[PDB]
Ligand binder design. Sequence first.
Ligand SMILES: Nc1nc2c(ncn2[C@H]2C[C@H](O)[C@@H](COP(=O)(O)OP(=O)(O)OP(=O)(O)O)O2)c(=O)[nH]1
Ligand SMILES: [Ca+2]
Ligand SMILES: [Ca+2]
Ligand SMILES: [Ca+2]
Length: 342
Amino acid sequence: HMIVLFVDFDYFYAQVEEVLNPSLKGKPVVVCVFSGRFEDSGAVATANYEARKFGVKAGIPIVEAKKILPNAVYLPMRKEVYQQVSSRIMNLLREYSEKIEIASIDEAYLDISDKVRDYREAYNLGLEIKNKILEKEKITVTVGISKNKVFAKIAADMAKPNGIKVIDDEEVKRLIRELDIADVPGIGNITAEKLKKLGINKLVDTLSIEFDKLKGMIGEAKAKYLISLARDEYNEPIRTRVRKSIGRIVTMKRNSRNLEEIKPYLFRAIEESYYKLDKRIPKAIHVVAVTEDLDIVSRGRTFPHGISKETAYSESVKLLQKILEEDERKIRRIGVRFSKFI
DNA sequence: GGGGGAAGGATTCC
DNA sequence: ACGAATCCTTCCCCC
Ligand SMILES: Nc1nc2c(ncn2[C@H]2C[C@H](O)[C@@H](COP(=O)(O)OP(=O)(O)OP(=O)(O)O)O2)c(=O)[nH]1
Ligand SMILES: [Ca+2]
Ligand SMILES: [Ca+2]
Ligand SMILES: [Ca+2]
C-alpha cells in the first residue's frame, strides 16, 4: 500500500542545453565529453531524441556520432550547470512529499502513501508535478507510479519520453511473469548473461531455482533482491541518500608510466577533488588508474583522522607508485577518490 | 566459528 | 571511450 512516485527527467543534459538556448530545440543535440587525445576523442554523455532516432546515444564515441550526424550541434558537457538546475527541480519535488529519495542528478522517488490514496489520485498528482516542473523550469520529465521503487522506475522506463504511467498490482503480477529479466534495474549484461545460463529469463524463473545455486552465481544480495521481487515482496523504504564519495579522474595527453609525467594530472585531480569536498573532511583516499587497455586498478588507504590536502598529495604519490610497481601496463587515465567523511 | 573492518576488484547506472 | 554506489572475495586480527 506503499504508493511510490518516481521522477526521471527527459534526456536531461541535452534538454538543459536546449532550455539555456531554446533555438536548439528540434535540432539534433549531442552533449559530449572531450578527452583531449585528438580531434574529437571522447564519448557522448547523452543526446536529445532528435539525435537518438539515428543511433546517436550515450556511450558512443564522438567520432562515430559525427559520422552519423555531421551537422548536429555538439556541445561540451557542463555538469555543474545541469546539477544546479537539477537541485532546483528536486526542491520543487520536496513540496509534494517529505519522504523523498534523490537517486541521482536526474531522478527521485517520492513516497506519496500518506499523501493520497488509490492510483487515480496518484496519476493526477503526477500531472501536477510534471506541469509544475514544466512551468517552473521548463523541463519535461517522465513519471512512474507503482507499489515499490523498482516498479515505479520500470513504469517510467516504459513511458519515456515525457510520459506518466501507473503499474497497478495486477500489471505487476503480469510483469513478474512477462518482463525480460534484463529490464529489471540492477541487472546488467553480466548478470543478464549469468541468469540466462541458469534458465532465468523472467523474474518468475528465479523461484524455480535452488537458492544456493542462484546465490552461487550472482551473489547473495542480488539473489535475494530478485527472489524478493518475484514474490511480489520487494518493499524497500524511500530514504534520503547522502554523498559518500568525491573524486576526479582525467585523461592524460598520452599514456605513460613515468611518475613525473603523471603527477601533474594526479595533482590536478586532487585540487579539484578538494574544492568539491566543500567543508567535508575525508578519512580515506584512493588513487584510481585507468590503464591503456581500459582496465581500472586502484590503491587506497584509510587514516584514523582526516586528510589535509598536503597529506593527500603526499599519500597519492605513494599509491600511484604502488600501482606502477604492481601493474606493468601503461596508464591512460589517472585520478583520486576521497571518502569516509568525518 | 565468527564479529569487524580494510582492501581491491566487479557490476551497475546516472 | 568519458562519476558514484553497492556488493563480493580475500585478508587479517582476535576472542
Ligand atoms: N558522462 C556521462 N554521462 C552520462 C552517461 N549516461 C548518463 N549520463 C548523464 C547524462 C544524462 O542526461 C543523465 C541522465 O541519464 P539517463 O540514463 O536518464 O539519460 P537521459 O536522461 O539523457 O535520457 P532519457 O530521456 O532518461 O532516456 O546522466 C554516460 O554514459 N556518461
Ligand atoms: Ca532521464
Ligand atoms: Ca535517470
Ligand atoms: Ca539491463
